[PDB]
């Protein structure tokens with residue numbers, strides 16, 4: 001029902017399995033938990049925000065809002081994004 | 087060839103820009119060529135004279151990021167309402183976008199990342215490419 | 224109306240959603256199913272303020288406007304253990320590098 005996504009700095013993110021399954025990479029690492037030795041907190045908190053954003057707004061006719069990304073965080077998020085295939 | 091049909095049967099259309107981007111409407115000629123029209127500021131609407139079976143797509147005026155229209159990629163006037171939306175971009179493409187919009191394209195070389203993310207940045211969204219990816223389907 | 228939340232204690236973060244009209248207590252029932260600790264042993268917070276069990280999320284300040292999928296509102300969580308209740312402590316996330324060129 002839920003899985004745990006652990007970051008480089010050991011913050012623990014608990015997210016519905018379905019949401020996490022937005023990442024093909026994570027989909028494969030599963031099928032309990034997953035550790036990400038090279039993804040920091042500040043980045044993985046945004047990824048999980050994306051999974052929930054993705055699952056809410058896909059297949060929607062009622063105007064989607066932008067996904068906001070702070071410039072400070074763009075580069076790392078790009079790398080994580082690329083790795084996780086999402 | 088993905089082209090407008092030359093029906094000559096008028097068809098009034100409303101373009102509503104339900105997105106935060108400056109939208110650029112694009113009409114595909116009878117010869118298949120993308121023809122750009124005046125830009126739609128974010129949130130605004132515009133009444134348009136088109137024709138039945140004609141073909142339109144919409145893009146971000148500034149960055150050519152693709153957008154959806156009535157949930158799909160192409161809009162064709164019937165007997166009309168054209169609602170223009172952000173797709174749910176992938177988180178990666180979404181990141182490319184912000185990076186692209188923050189960095190002069192000559193300086194992609196200077197950023198600290200895999201060589202393959204350098205080539206992703208350089209591979210700008212583009213109407214001609216999208217027509218090829220849509221012509222195959 | 225769905226409300227999108229980040230439930231936070233220590234280095235623990237749960238991503239969940241709830242009806243605006245559901246209660247702080249119902250939320251506790253949800254933390255329970257996840258973190259295996261009965262309501263009983265939990266305090267929920269908005270910012271620093273301690274939330275009352277029978278108050279709805281809307282009434283507590285989580286609305287569609289402030290609790291969005293892409294920008295969830297945070298709910299502070301504290302546990303008891305013995306008999307006392309720990310203090311509310313949420314470890315912040317890591318800092319991003321200073322910007323290159325902008």
Ligand SMILES: Cc1cc(CC(=O)N2C[C@H](O)C[C@H]2C(=O)NCc2ccc(N(O)O)cc2)on1
Pocket residue numbers: 092094111113123124132134135136137140
């Ligand atoms: C006959 C005949 C002529 C044409 C060319 C044409 O007039 N088109 C093609 C597209 O359906 C749109 C339509 C057109 O250009 N209408 C006038 C117009 C002027 C301004 C704008 N905007 O500024 O958005 C939109 C449409 O197609 N069949």
